Design a protein around this motif. Structure first.
Motif, mmCIF file in Angstrom:
data_model
loop_
_atom_site.group_PDB
_atom_site.id
_atom_site.type_symbol
_atom_site.label_atom_id
_atom_site.label_comp_id
_atom_site.label_asym_id
_atom_site.label_seq_id
_atom_site.Cartn_x
_atom_site.Cartn_y
_atom_site.Cartn_z
ATOM 1 N N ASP A 242 57.336 3.428 -29.574
ATOM 2 C CA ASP A 242 57.354 3.151 -28.145
ATOM 3 C C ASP A 242 57.656 1.672 -28.009
ATOM 4 O O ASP A 242 56.782 0.851 -28.255
ATOM 5 C CB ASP A 242 55.998 3.508 -27.529
ATOM 6 C CG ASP A 242 55.891 3.150 -26.062
ATOM 7 O OD1 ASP A 242 56.800 2.493 -25.530
ATOM 8 O OD2 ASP A 242 54.899 3.514 -25.386
ATOM 9 N N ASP A 288 51.144 2.832 -20.655
ATOM 10 C CA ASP A 288 50.188 3.855 -21.060
ATOM 11 C C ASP A 288 49.515 4.499 -19.845
ATOM 12 O O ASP A 288 49.162 5.675 -19.883
ATOM 13 C CB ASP A 288 49.087 3.267 -21.938
ATOM 14 C CG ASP A 288 49.586 2.779 -23.274
ATOM 15 O OD1 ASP A 288 48.944 1.838 -23.798
ATOM 16 O OD2 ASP A 288 50.573 3.304 -23.839
ATOM 17 N N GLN A 292 53.435 6.734 -20.694
ATOM 18 C CA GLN A 292 54.739 6.290 -21.159
ATOM 19 C C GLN A 292 54.613 5.378 -22.383
ATOM 20 O O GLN A 292 53.548 4.814 -22.640
ATOM 21 C CB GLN A 292 55.471 5.554 -20.024
ATOM 22 C CG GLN A 292 55.884 6.457 -18.864
ATOM 23 C CD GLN A 292 57.107 7.312 -19.137
ATOM 24 O OE1 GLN A 292 57.538 7.477 -20.282
ATOM 25 N NE2 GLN A 292 57.661 7.882 -18.078
ATOM 26 N N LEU A 293 55.686 5.211 -23.155
ATOM 27 C CA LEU A 293 56.943 5.947 -23.036
ATOM 28 C C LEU A 293 56.845 7.283 -23.754
ATOM 29 O O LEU A 293 56.449 7.343 -24.922
ATOM 30 C CB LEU A 293 58.093 5.133 -23.631
ATOM 31 C CG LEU A 293 58.539 3.943 -22.777
ATOM 32 C CD1 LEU A 293 59.475 3.034 -23.564
ATOM 33 C CD2 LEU A 293 59.209 4.376 -21.475
ATOM 34 N N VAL A 296 53.627 8.331 -25.776
ATOM 35 C CA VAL A 296 53.158 7.559 -26.919
ATOM 36 C C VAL A 296 52.163 6.481 -26.487
ATOM 37 O O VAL A 296 52.441 5.692 -25.580
ATOM 38 C CB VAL A 296 54.333 6.893 -27.663
ATOM 39 C CG1 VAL A 296 53.834 6.027 -28.813
ATOM 40 C CG2 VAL A 296 55.306 7.948 -28.185
ATOM 41 N N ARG A 297 51.013 6.434 -27.143
ATOM 42 C CA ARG A 297 50.036 5.388 -26.894
ATOM 43 C C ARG A 297 49.368 5.016 -28.203
ATOM 44 O O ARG A 297 49.351 5.802 -29.163
ATOM 45 C CB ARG A 297 49.004 5.847 -25.865
ATOM 46 C CG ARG A 297 48.133 6.988 -26.291
ATOM 47 C CD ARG A 297 47.164 7.430 -25.209
ATOM 48 N NE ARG A 297 46.230 8.430 -25.721
ATOM 49 C CZ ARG A 297 46.415 9.749 -25.672
ATOM 50 N NH1 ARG A 297 47.500 10.272 -25.123
ATOM 51 N NH2 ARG A 297 45.492 10.555 -26.184
HETATM 52 CA CA LIG Z 1 52.728 3.638 -24.549
#
Ligand SMILES: [Ca+2]
Length: 320
Positions: A242, A288, A292-293, A296-297
């Motif tokens: 990300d 987050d 996003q994105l 993915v965090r």
């Molecule tokens: Ca993220």
């Protein structure tokens, strides 16, 4: 599926700067969130506003959102909406609650710069170092075209310079004088206001939360270093998969060196406070907050889809 997120009044999700409901008609701003809420019984609409504009003004995002609210009410037969705004979308939501208080049941802001952004101050300041002003004209054209191309409707009403100015700390302070709110504390307080407001006899429930992944953690010779607490240090695959993770760590570092304190990369904790502050401890960067994105965090980040879903249930239990 169930009715965990079923609210009395329809929810409208309201994007911020750069946004639209779906970038290029393909990438949802609110990634997977409308789907999740609908699976849990919510009636949810996603606004599509100018990605680059002021919130006030006849052509601003506020009047756009007001018009959209009226279409949602006509479509659903409902009489009010619950506004949930991310970033500048929280400012837009405040505008509608102030000018059409009878049409709003609640305002929730997520990572909203109620007091502006030190990062906007930085970018505005950078442009002042071109004594010809040509940088402003050229980069505005570039960003405005980005807005037209990525808007799901190819919305040509884009004004990047106005959007930038809108998000500066000095201008946000003016916005708050023009559109006061019982949900706001005093300027300079780093405090919230009341959990509800009654405007023209219409009560609104007010809520916010903030992401504070970017923490100031060291000071050496006047320079402040930050830590991204959303991640396992360095090795977190969110740093790889990300690109916004490291980007927001970088902007968040600029923020802390402009005195912002803890932040999500572009909005400080203090700037984000409004209404009933449900949390400012989420280990989230700014993207987050909207999953996003592409979902993915960092490993230490809470699930934003679950947080928003639980908030729909909170609204339900509160009577909206
Ligand atoms: Ca993220």
């Amino acid at each position: 599926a169930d009715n965990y997120a079923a609210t009395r009044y329809p929810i409208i999700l309201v994007h911020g700067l750069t946004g639209t409901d779906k970038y290029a008609g393909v990438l949802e701003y609110w990634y997977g969130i409308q789907e999740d809420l609908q699976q849990r019984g919510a009636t949810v609409y996603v606004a599509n506003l100018s990605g680059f504009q002021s919130d006030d003004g006849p052509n601003g995002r506020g009047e756009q959102l007001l018009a959209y609210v009226k279409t949602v009410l006509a479509a659903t037969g409902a009489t009010k909406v619950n506004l949930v705004g991310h970033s500048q979308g929280g400012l837009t939501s405040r505008y509608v609650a102030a000018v059409a208080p009878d049409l709003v049941a609640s305002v929730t802001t997520i990572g909203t710069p109620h007091r502006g952004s030190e990062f906007a101050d930085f970018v505005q300041g950078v442009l002042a170092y071109d004594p010809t002003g040509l940088s402003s004209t050229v980069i505005a054209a570039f960003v405005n075209v980005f807005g037209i191309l990525t808007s799901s409707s190819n919305n040509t009403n884009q004004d990047a310079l106005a959007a930038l100015k809108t998000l500066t700390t000095a201008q946000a302070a003016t916005y708050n004088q023009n559109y006061p709110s019982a949900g706001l504390g005093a300027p300079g307080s780093c405090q919230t206001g009341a959990p509800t407001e009654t405007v023209g006899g219409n009560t609104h429930l007010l809520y916010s939360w903030a992401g504070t992944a970017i923490q100031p953690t060291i000071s050496v010779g006047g320079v402040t270093g930050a830590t991204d607490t959303s991640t396992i240090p360095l090795v977190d695959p969110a740093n790889a998969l990300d690109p916004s993770t490291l980007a927001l760590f970088g902007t968040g570092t600029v923020m802390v060196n402009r005195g912002s304190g803890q932040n999500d990369g572009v909005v400080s904790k203090c700037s984000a406070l409004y209404g009933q502050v449900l949390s400012t401890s989420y280990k989230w960067n700014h993207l987050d907050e909207i999953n996003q994105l592409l979902g993915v965090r960092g490993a230490n980040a809470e699930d934003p889809v679950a947080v928003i879903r639980t908030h729909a249930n909170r609204l339900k239990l509160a009577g909206v």
